[PDB]
């Protein structure tokens, strides 16, 4: 996040040192600066790379999900936690193979009457319950699971500033894997083809669990719908192994492609 070096003045040359010539076969990039190939003046550099630090690049709340609940089973909804339901944050994360950070979740809740001239309801309170992989998932908008004696819940009152909570680095590995070239199972010799088969590039069937959202108020016959837009921001970021960015449209959770396979336009070789 710092300063750039100054340009030193450089005069003419006539020597056996040729920085302009190189050999990219080695796998290295030629570290030339302007003064290597032209005469330069002294410039005191004041520009910095403060905004392109790994932290500043991700320091934005991106939408990862839009959970919908109809307060007239739709009285409650469950969202399997992921960053792949949307494309924008996903593409930025995928510039790297591994990552490690904390997360900040902000929830923007909106609601409205479906009918322009019918129904009425008192102010709604929402419960956003996190169900860690293993915990019982709600079957009804009002069954015993909503007691949350151990699961973390967030109760949001409609109209209040967006709710917000922080989550630590929760991975079971030392870093989050954006790419996993493997399987969760190894098919063994002799077992039925139905056996030992698993998805390519998938780890746990339930990585991070899911969110169960519901309106706590008793539902009125009035037609109402609410939407909880989930925004996530990685804070305290560290990333490893850069990768080229996604060039064609995403086709699922994997690196699969199908449709926009011809991303580049035509342009004449000798056309400026």
């Amino acid at each position: 996040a710092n300063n750039l070096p100054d340009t030193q003045s450089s005069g003419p040359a006539h020597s056996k040192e040729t920085p302009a010539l190189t050999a990219v076969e080695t796998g290295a990039t030629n570290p030339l600066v302007p003064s290597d190939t032209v005469q330069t003046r002294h410039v005191i550099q004041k520009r910095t790379r403060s905004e392109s630090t790994v932290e500043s690049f991700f320091a934005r709340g991106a939408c990862v999900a839009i959970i919908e609940v109809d307060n007239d089973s739709k009285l409650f909804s469950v969202w399997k936690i992921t960053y792949k339901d949307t494309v924008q944050l996903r593409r930025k994360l995928e510039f790297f193979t591994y990552s490690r950070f904390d997360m900040e979740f902000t929830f923007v809740v909106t609601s409205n009457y479906t009918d322009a001239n019918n129904g009425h309801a008192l102010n709604q309170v929402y419960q956003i319950m996190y169900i860690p992989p293993g915990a019982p998932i709600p079957g009804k908008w009002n069954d015993y699971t909503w007691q949350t004696s151990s699961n973390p819940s967030v109760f949001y009152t409609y109209g209040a500033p967006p709710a917000r909570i922080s989550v630590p680095y929760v991975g079971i590995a030392n870093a989050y894997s954006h790419f996993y070239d493997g399987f969760a199972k190894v098919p063994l010799a002799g077992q039925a083809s139905t056996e030992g088969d698993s998805l390519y590039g998938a780890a746990s069937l339930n990585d991070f669990g899911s969110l169960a959202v519901r309106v706590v108020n008793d539902h009125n016959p009035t037609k109402l719908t609410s939407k909880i837009r989930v925004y996530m921001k990685p804070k305290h970021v560290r990333v490893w192994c850069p990768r080229p960015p996604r060039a064609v449209p995403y086709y699922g959770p994997g690196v699969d492609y199908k449709d926009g396979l011809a991303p580049l336009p035509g342009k004449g070789l000798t056309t400026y």
Partner: protein, 68 residues
């Protein structure tokens, strides 16, 4: 437990406060026990790109012949 850092002043007001004093510092205090609750300090460091730009075993000088 307050942390006092200085800001990098961009646009300067016609004040001496825009050039010195606590007027170009900002104060921070953590209220939560879990580090996850903390904001980002944003006083982030940089590093050498060499691991990517020149992952070569036998180090070479730009003035000198790459293929030797």
């Amino acid at each position: 437990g307050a942390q006092v850092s200085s800001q990098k002043v961009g646009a300067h007001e016609n004040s001496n406060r825009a050039y010195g004093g606590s007027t170009i510092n900002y104060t921070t205090i953590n209220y939560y026990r879990d580090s996850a609750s903390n904001a980002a300090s944003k006083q982030d460091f940089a590093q050498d790109p060499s691991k990517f730009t020149e992952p070569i075993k036998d180090v070479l000088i730009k003035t000198a012949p790459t293929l030797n």
